[PDB]
């Protein structure tokens, strides 16, 4: 069941004490008229704070249980009342599925950790809040579904727990031998004091528009007229990010598709710029690649450019891709081709048994097998100086101790695969302080029409209705401005259409009212709103909408002057 | 931490059909290949299908081929198996493996290299 | 089909010796191979990829070796929580992934 409360969970929002102070305050409070769940069992959700009144002469409710987990390996609240008094606690517990001679308390069976302890019909209202660390209980006790009327409760507790929440429970005494869950949200109120201090009355100031009208007048008797109270304002839905069509195309072809590779000792690199493509157009005819992508998957860097791509494209064994990698030894990695240790890039290898080995040998691919030194980093090596190994110097001519130090692979289509050639392709992506002229994609989308919506255009940011223009700009203009200079029309990259840009309705709410000692009826004007874009009596005047009063053929003298020659009145 | 969870096994009749589920979670999914390993009762392991990390490429062990259909939803981290025409001899605990990428450049073809993150695995039992 | 054929089919070591089991390959699979450890109702476990590096937190005992054809795996002071079953698998070609037929190792 639900039940409709009606101004309940009120209570006094801090200490200072205060007189006839008509004072307005923000802060958690249960709604005026809300919807709260009722009981008469399952763990419940606590989200911001909680209401919970019941109802009954006996004392049916024994305690709560609060906390994230309502289970052990984790510390939790437990209240408990027996007929001596409240006893607040917090431990690492260990409850019962269902807690529940006159003996008791087989709602738990583990109280370790102990954190804090403390010892020491009818209405029983409680408020439970948790800021900041700080667990807050309001409460109050009142003789007499409920009732209709109007309580302020006071703080109960204060205390320093730290605790999480997130659910809670509640503990019942069964029969051996009904209550309510509200929550909190953020409202306002103006708030009404006596002379002894306390709170007699209140406004919910997100209600009914007599309630606001009383809000901003801190008042609660308004006298007749017309006031403005708040206002309009239409929200843009979805978000459209249109562009161009893909410009130009990145020359990877001739780097994967060249006839001829580098040797690695001569690795080539290919230095791109400017030029637009998704970068999953690699890894298209898919399953024959080594594609090994470090740190970043090519989803992830899909849609996120680069000032610079290098491709550095060589040959080697099979045996040896696995040098292609940052943090790697080998005669490839150590002589010929090292990454460095913070690599984010890619490598792709595939075989080319096909195309650079053959009967005779291939001995057109070489690698350096001798150096005095490992290469730094994206270093390259071409000399071709003889190696000194012995303590001779070699002068330039091979023999003992003194070796050309560029062998070369043998490539024979019957080599075992971990012999034969495969070409590699090293992608690098650099990011600088130079504008980033390699991206792929920018996000597909489509383009409505007549509706505020949030968009941009190739960088143009804003807000508003699009409808099809009547403008003319000049063959190299994307879009126009009006005077004050404000962007009012624009040109869809894609589709070459002049639109224009309007903003989407706003304009201040005025509340009409006879006086609170004559009625709380009142009408609404919507100041130069349309009635077809304000979401009875709709009644449309040159200064908007008016609803909520009927409009009528006589003429009578001007009481409440709405405007334009239009009047309201509390007659008929 | 990375986590395989299968679902689906259970007792079929032979010529029937099943379809196994494997939840992938502590991982980016689409950042790797993925693959079915089985071990029938007391046997070695079989290698039974893989996928790379798009779902642009699948193999299939011989003994499975045209019968067994690999497909992944990336969006839901989820791998699948459907198993048709299934026999006495497809009697085994199935595990789904994240195919792990070998020392680097490892010239593999797909994505699938070793299996380097098992999980417990789902028994599918095919009898009369 | 590549076929993957280990060696012993059973190893009965005492706990501190060194245990070393073979794998050969059919064909030459390079340096893609795995090797895996399996207890009793637990998940393979990968040990050793690409034939000698080994896989994050196993534990320094444990060192692969060979390339082509032949391969090993070395534990160097075996530990009683060592005891279980080994396979060796190749990644060479794919499809299919082969692996080996296992090696039981025991306490002796």
């Known amino acids: 069941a639900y039940t409709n409360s009606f101004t309940r969970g009120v209570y006094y929002p801090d200490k200072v004490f205060r007189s006839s102070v008509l004072h307005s305050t923000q802060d958690l409070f249960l709604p005026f008229f809300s919807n709260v769940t009722w009981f008469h069992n399952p763990v419940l959700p606590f989200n911001d704070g909680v209401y919970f009144a019941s109802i009954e002469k006996s004392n049916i409710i024994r305690g709560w249980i609060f906390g994230t987990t309502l289970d052990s390996k984790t510390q939790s609240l437990l209240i408990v009342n027996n007929a001596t008094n409240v006893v607040i606690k917090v431990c690492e517990f260990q409850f019962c599925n269902d807690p529940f001679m006159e003996s008791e308390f087989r709602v738990y069976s583990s109280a370790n950790n102990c954190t804090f302890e403390y010892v020491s019909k009818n209405l029983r209202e409680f408020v439970f809040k948790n800021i900041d660390g700080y667990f807050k209980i309001y409460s109050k006790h009142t003789p007499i579904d409920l009732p209709q009327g109007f309580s302020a409760l006071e703080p109960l507790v204060d205390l320093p727990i730290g605790i999480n929440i997130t659910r809670f429970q509640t503990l019942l005494a069964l029969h051996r031998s009904a209550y309510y869950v509200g929550y909190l949200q953020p409202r306002t109120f103006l708030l009404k004091y006596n002379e002894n201090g306390t709170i007699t009355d209140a406004v919910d100031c997100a209600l009914d528009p007599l309630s606001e009208t009383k809000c901003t007048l801190k008042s609660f008797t308004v006298e007749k007229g017309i006031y403005q109270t708040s206002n309009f304002r239409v929200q843009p839905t979805e978000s459209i990010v249109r562009f161009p069509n893909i410009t130009n195309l990145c020359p990877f072809d001739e780097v994967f598709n060249a006839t001829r590779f580098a040797s690695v000792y001569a690795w080539n690199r290919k230095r791109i710029s400017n030029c637009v493509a998704d970068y999953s157009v690699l890894y298209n005819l898919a399953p024959f690649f080594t594609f090994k992508c470090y740190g970043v998957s090519p989803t992830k860097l899909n849609d996120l450019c680069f000032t610079n791509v290098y491709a550095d494209s060589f040959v080697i064994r099979g045996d040896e891709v696995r040098q292609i990698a940052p943090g790697q030894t080998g005669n490839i990695a150590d002589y010929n081709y090292k990454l460095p240790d913070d690599f984010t890039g890619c490598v792709i290898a595939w075989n080319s048994n096909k195309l650079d080995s053959k009967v005779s040998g291939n001995y057109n691919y070489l690698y350096r097998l001798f150096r005095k030194s490992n290469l730094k980093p994206f270093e390259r090596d071409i000399s071709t100086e003889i190696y000194q190994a012995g303590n001779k110097p070699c002068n330039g001519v091979a023999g003992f101790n003194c070796y050309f130090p560029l062998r070369s692979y043998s490539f024979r289509p019957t080599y075992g695969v971990g012999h034969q050639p495969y070409r590699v392709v090293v992608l690098s992506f650099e990011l600088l302080h130079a504008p980033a002229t390699v991206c792929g994609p920018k996000k597909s989308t489509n383009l409505v029409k007549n509706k505020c919506v949030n968009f941009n255009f190739n960088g143009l940011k804003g807000t508003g209705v699009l409808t099809e223009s009547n403008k003319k700009f000049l063959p190299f203009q994307q879009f126009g401005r009006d005077i004050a200079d404000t962007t009012d029309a624009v040109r869809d990259p894609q589709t070459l259409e002049i639109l224009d840009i309007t903003p989407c309705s706003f304009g201040g709410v005025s509340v009409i009212t006879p006086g609170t000692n004559t009625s709380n009826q009142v009408a609404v004007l919507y100041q130069g709103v349309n009635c077809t874009e304000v979401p009875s009596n709709v009644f449309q005047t040159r200064a908007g909408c008016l609803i909520g009063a009927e409009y009528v053929n006589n003429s009578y003298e001007c009481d409440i002057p709405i405007g334009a020659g239009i009047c309201a009145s509390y007659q008929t | 931490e990375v986590q395989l969870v299968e679902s689906g096994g259970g007792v079929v009749r032979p010529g029937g059909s099943l379809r196994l589920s494997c939840a992938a979670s502590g991982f980016t999914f689409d950042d790797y290949g993925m693959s079915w390993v089985r071990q029938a009762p007391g046997k070695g392991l079989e290698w039974v299908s893989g996928?790379?990390?798009?779902?642009?490429?699948?193999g299939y062990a011989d003994s499975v081929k045209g019968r067994f259909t690999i497909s992944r939803d990336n969006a839901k981290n989820s791998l699948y198996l459907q198993m048709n025409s299934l026999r006495a001899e497809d009697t085994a605990l199935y595990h789904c493996?994240?195919?792990?990428?070998?020392?680097?450049?490892?010239?593999?073809?797909?994505?699938?290299?070793?299996?380097?993150?098992w999980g417990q695995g789902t028994l599918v039992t095919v009898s009369s | 089909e590549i076929v993957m054929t280990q060696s012993p089919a059973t190893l009965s070591v005492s706990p501190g010796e060194r245990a070393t089991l073979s794998c050969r390959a059919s064909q030459s699979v390079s340096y893609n191979l795995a090797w895996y450890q399996q207890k009793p109702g637990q998940a393979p476990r990968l040990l050793i990829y690409?034939?000698?590096t080994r896989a994050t937190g196993i534990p320094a005992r444990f060192s692969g070796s060979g390339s082509g054809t032949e391969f090993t795996l070395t534990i160097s002071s075996l530990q009683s929580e060592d005891f279980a079953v080994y396979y060796c698998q190749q990644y060479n070609n794919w499809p299919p992934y082969t692996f080996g037929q296992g090696t039981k190792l025991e306490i002796k």
């Open positions: 996928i790379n990390w798009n779902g642009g490429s699948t």
């Open positions: 690409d034939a000698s």
């Open positions: 493996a994240r195919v792990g990428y070998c020392g680097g450049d490892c010239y593999s073809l797909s994505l699938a290299g070793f299996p380097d993150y």
